[PDB]
């Protein structure tokens, strides 16, 4: 079973084996058994660590139930894949991904003094094609200031920097005006409706470019693995794939008592049973008890 | 779906668009008579407007019975649809069995006949490896783990370049 | 034997989920 801080994550997830374990947990609840008390302790580092290591347990069954739109025609298959990834993110506890990476910039640059510290300590969480375009404008404003541009906002030099960072930002293709006015909010919602429309149509364009870029990478990686695979004769392919499968089976059989090796061999028995069920009735597929 | 649906016998479909199955409704104010024509069988049913509202109560909740996963089935599907692209241009190789005769032998130069025989064996090697279709089920299992490690991030699964650029501009151009 | 279930088959099989659960169960009692 669980330690009951796992099981509060698995209530809203619609994955399969989380649902089966949580239905057995609710069945044990029905027969006069009590819930365990949530430990109201484990200060913020343990809270973020356990959150990070228990959101993996909801994204990782959730990724493998998401079918890629590899080589499909149009745009809307990528929108299916990216909407299903957004739904997986909302079921694993993460927020809307824009505000999630904005939260990460708030976590990384809480205590930065100058804009050069901002472009240093957040280099990995932003594109380098944009980070170089910001470091050049940082040097350009740094030459006229002849001092580091401090991270306040009251500065005139920071305003001259931001007026060209907005310029390179709209030069990249994202309209910075609608994004700043959306996340900065307005009072009357009828005047904010159009800026929410513009932010969302950019944001839909943006996450489709994200998911389609990952799909282009998977397309090229599968094409490269196949183009290296079709150069081999079948003797090398057969002995190679049988040896690699037997090596991973021996590696997952060297571990005993651990849960992951036991579940590994259990799912190996599942795929052997699936081959037997497709062999018994090739017109209907697998036998599913209804 | 949501817990409530708001459709049924109101702006409903009236006819069929195919001849493979024919559908004729007789929708009255209280009930409806759907006499559907389908092959050699035929059914004439009776549903009311509040009888279709009892449809979406217990939801269907479809799922995909897969061999390994739905992700790995999709990558294996793409590998098979690439092997079709390769196989279609092994379908346009010229026949050489029309030139296996001994009349083309002794008119042929020895080096060029040897290179023709090695070319034919090279075609047989290509065609034997491009139709090893049982190897794709493991060939896609090397594309999966880097992809699964790229969706298992510390921030969000579907996060990437341009959304991080938009939030970087939104983070920078605000007042500090 | 045959015709297992439906919910036994919707499980994505060779996902991780259990290396991570084992890492968490040998991490958090060792880091508290």
């Amino acid at each position: 079973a669980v330690s009951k801080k796992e099981v509060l994550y698995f209530l809203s997830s619609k994955d399969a084996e989380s649902s089966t374990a949580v239905k057995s947990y609710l069945k044990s609840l029905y027969a006069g058994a009590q819930v365990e008390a949530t430990e109201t302790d484990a200060s913020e580092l343990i809270a973020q660590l356990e959150k990070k290591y228990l959101s993996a347990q909801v994204v990782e069954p959730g990724v493998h139930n998401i079918a890629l739109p590899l080589g499909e025609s149009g745009s809307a298959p990528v929108k299916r894949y990216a909407a299903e990834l957004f739904n997986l993110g909302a079921q694993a506890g993460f927020e809307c991904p824009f505000i999630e990476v904005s939260k990460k910039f708030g976590q990384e640059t809480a205590t930065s003094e100058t804009v050069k510290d901002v472009l240093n300590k957040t280099k990995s969480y932003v594109s380098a094609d944009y980070n170089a375009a910001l470091n050049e404008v940082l040097s350009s404003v740094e030459a006229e200031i002849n001092g580091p541009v401090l991270f306040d906002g009251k500065t005139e030099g920071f305003k001259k920097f931001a007026a060209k960072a907005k310029a390179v930002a709209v030069s990249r293709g994202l309209p910075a005006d609608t994004i700043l006015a959306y996340c900065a909010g307005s009072a009357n919602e009828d005047a904010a409706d159009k800026v929410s429309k513009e932010f969302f149509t950019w944001f839909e364009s943006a996450y489709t470019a994200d998911a389609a870029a990952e799909v282009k990478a998977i397309e090229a990686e599968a094409a490269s693995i196949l183009d290296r695979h079709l150069a081999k004769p079948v003797a090398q392919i057969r002995k190679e794939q049988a040896s690699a499968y037997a090596s991973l089976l021996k590696r997952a059989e060297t571990a005993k008592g651990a849960k992951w090796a036991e579940k590994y061999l259990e799912d190996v028995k599942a795929v052997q049973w699936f081959d037997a069920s497709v062999a018994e009735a090739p017109a209907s597929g697998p036998k599913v008890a209804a | 779906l949501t817990t409530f649906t708001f459709s049924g016998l109101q702006d409903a479909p009236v006819a069929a668009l195919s001849g493979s199955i024919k559908l004729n409704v007789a929708a009255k104010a209280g009930k409806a008579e759907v006499t559907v024509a389908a092959g050699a069988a035929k059914a004439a049913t009776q549903v009311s407007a509040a009888a279709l509202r009892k449809l979406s109560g217990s939801k269907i909740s479809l799922a995909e019975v897969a061999r390994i996963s739905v992700l790995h089935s999709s990558i294996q599907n793409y590998l098979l649809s690439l092997s079709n692209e390769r196989y279609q241009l092994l379908s346009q190789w010229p026949d050489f069995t029309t030139m296996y005769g001994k009349d083309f032998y002794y008119r042929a130069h020895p080096e060029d006949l040897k290179k023709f025989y090695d070319a034919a064996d090279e075609y047989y090697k290509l065609y034997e490896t491009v139709t090893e279709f049982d190897s794709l089920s493991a060939l896609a299992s090397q594309v999966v783990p880097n992809y699964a490690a790229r969706r298992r991030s510390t921030v969000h699964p579907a996060i990437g370049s341009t959304v991080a650029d938009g939030a970087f501009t939104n983070f920078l151009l605000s007042k500090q | 034997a045959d015709a297992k279930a439906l919910d036994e088959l919707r499980k994505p099989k060779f996902s991780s989920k259990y290396l991570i659960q084992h890492v968490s169960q040998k991490l958090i009692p060792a880091v508290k």
């Binding site: 990995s124 594109s127 990686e221 | 299992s141 | -």
Partner: peptide
């Protein structure tokens, strides 16, 4: 068909490193 199970967390948000579409098809046409 089974994969090596990796449990590691990608910290960097980067472009996904598209590979080069290889020269197998031009080789087979050659």
């Amino acid at each position: 068909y089974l994969a090596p199970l990796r449990s590691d967390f990608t910290e960097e948000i980067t472009a996904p490193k598209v590979a080069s579409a290889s020269n197998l098809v031009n080789e087979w046409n050659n």
